[PDB]
Amino acid sequence: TVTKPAEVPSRIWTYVMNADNAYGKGGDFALLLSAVIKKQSYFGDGLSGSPSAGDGLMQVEPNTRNAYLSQFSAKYGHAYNHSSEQDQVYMGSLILNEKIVRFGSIYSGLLHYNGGDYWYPGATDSYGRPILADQYANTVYAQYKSYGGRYSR
């Protein structure tokens, strides 16, 4: 505990481990972030073709990135740079950590990361796509555990 999952590209592992270090999570957060990135962008390979392609590795929506800019700068010591893949991961990590702490659990953190705080079945994203936040949380939590995750909170 813990090892890089074989299927996670080594550049991505570095980003998530840097994020893990910033929150003192012993490598466990990095496993969760790996699962999130696999689902959101497939490490960057599943982006092309999508209206939300430009939102990067963790697919944080523009209005959501905008709300967290000052907090990002405070946490990481530099202004958010969307062209930086490490910053993309740092931003997604900050928001997911915030949700997990605020709502009280990983599952709920994942659900509200994907759906927002006021998700309901039939809610749509900034591109008008239906958000299956419950299914997202289920499948990302399973992937997290499959990578060797060991927490619920």
Ligand X SMILES: CC(=O)N[C@@H]1[C@@H](O)[C@H](O[C@@H]2O[C@H](CO)[C@@H](O[C@@H]3O[C@H](CO)[C@@H](O[C@@H]4O[C@H](CO)[C@@H](O)[C@H](O)[C@H]4NC(C)=O)[C@H](O)[C@H]3NC(C)=O)[C@H](O)[C@H]2NC(C)=O)[C@@H](CO)O[C@H]1O
First to last CA, the chain: 18
CB 3 to ligand X: min, Å: 26
* Cβ nearer to ligand X, comparing 26 with 54: 54
The stretches of the chain forming alpha helices (DSSP H) are 10-22, 28-41, 62-67, 69-76, 85-103, 106-115, 133-146
Distance of alpha carbon 71 from alpha carbon 135, whole angstroms? 29
* Cβ nearer to ligand X, comparing 119 with 144: 119
> By beta-carbon distance, which residue lies closest to ligand X?
116
45 is an interface residue for ligand X by CB under 6 A: no
Farthest CA pair distance, the chain: 40
Give, as one character, the DSSP assignment of residue 8. Answer: S
CB 1 to ligand X: min, Å: 27
Binding interface with ligand X (CB under 6 A): 39-41, 46-47, 50, 52-53, 59-61, 63-64, 67, 95, 113-114, 116-119, 123, 125-126, 129, 131, 136
